[PDB]
Amino acid sequence: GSPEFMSHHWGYGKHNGPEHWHKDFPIAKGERQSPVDIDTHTAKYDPSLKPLSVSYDQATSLRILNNGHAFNVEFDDSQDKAVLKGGPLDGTYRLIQFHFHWGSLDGQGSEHTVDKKKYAAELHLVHWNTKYGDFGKAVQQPDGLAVLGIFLKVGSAKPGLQKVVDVLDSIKTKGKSADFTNFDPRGLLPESLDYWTYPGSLTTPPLLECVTWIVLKEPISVSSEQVLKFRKLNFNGEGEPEELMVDNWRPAQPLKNRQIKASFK
Ligand SMILES: *NCc1cc(C)nn1C
Ligand code: NA
Ligand code: NA
Numbered sequence: 001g002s003p004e005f006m007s008h009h010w011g012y013g014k015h016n017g018p019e020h021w022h023k024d025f026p027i028a029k030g031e032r033q034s035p036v037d038i039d040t041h042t043a044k045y046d047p048s049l050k051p052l053s054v055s056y057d058q059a060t061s062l063r064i065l066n067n068g069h070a071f072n073v074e075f076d077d078s079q080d081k082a083v084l085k086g087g088p089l090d091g092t093y094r095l096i097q098f099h100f101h102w103g104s105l106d107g108q109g110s111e112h113t114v115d116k117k118k119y120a121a122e123l124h125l126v127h128w129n130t131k132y133g134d135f136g137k138a139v140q141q142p143d144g145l146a147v148l149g150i151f152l153k154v155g156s157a158k159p160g161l162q163k164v165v166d167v168l169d170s171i172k173t174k175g176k177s178a179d180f181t182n183f184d185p186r187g188l189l190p191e192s193l194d195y196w197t198y199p200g201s202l203t204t205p206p207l208l209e210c211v212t213w214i215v216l217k218e219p220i221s222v223s224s225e226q227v228l229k230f231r232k233l234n235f236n237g238e239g240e241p242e243e244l245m246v247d248n249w250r251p252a253q254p255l256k257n258r259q260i261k262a263s264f265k
């Protein structure tokens with residue numbers, strides 16, 4: 001073998017989880033870490049914020065990968081096929097992958113919280129600023145990434161999520177991947193694009209402080225059965241002892257010298 005006996009690589013267990021990450025990644029204690037609690041009454045409506053422009057009609061999904069922490073749905077990011085513009089942004093940001101964070105129980109799983117409330121899961125659509133040419137260069141910049149965060153509440157099923165749920169059997173363990181072409185990420189959005197925004201970081205090591213966070217106010221509803229299937233994934237590789245992929249979330253971090261802005265009043 002089990003990872004706690006073998007290597008101290010970062011993860012979500014008691015011996016390698018978020019409270020340990022600072023040893024290898026000292027920016028974990030930095031000045032613009034994510035996630036944060038969104039205190040709805042102290043967010044500031046900002047009339048200079050523009051509507052968010054989500055252009056996903058030409059998106060090209062490619063593959064779904066269990067990376068040992070989450071699963072990533074990967075996209076072709078070699079052209080402006082699936083881009084995020086507007087909102088708080090001053091550039092064009094290409095979609096590279098999306099993934100989720102989720103809990104062992106319906107009452108936890110989100111990374112951001114809203115008035116201290118946790119959702120069952122949180123979707124992150126990760127985009128990089130095209131002026132930096134590649135994701136790797138973008139994460140050397142304070143405006144390199146834009147992450148669209150969407151909360152998942154348990155209620156009615158989300159039809160546009162079911163293709164993701166259905167394929168998870170085939171990527172149960174770390175390092176497994178499967179074809180995932182022709183997936184439309186528009187099916188994961190809520191009705192409204194009203195949002196909160198603030199400057200933050202990746203929520204996984206290396207925790208780089210590159211992200212303009214755009215967190216949608218409206219959650220999507222997913223069914224209990226959909227999120228239950230997320231919890232049958234494994235952190236471990238094939239042939240290793242089974243450790244269910246659950247509670248792969250970082251808790252809220254100090255807001256420090258930041259003020260969350262709202263696109264709506
Ligand atoms: N899980 C492998 C493992 C555990 C210990 C103590 N030694 N090994 C090789
Ligand atoms: Na801006
Ligand atoms: Na299946």
Ligand SMILES: [Zn+2]
Pocket residue numbers: 099100101124203
């Ligand atoms: Zn994430």
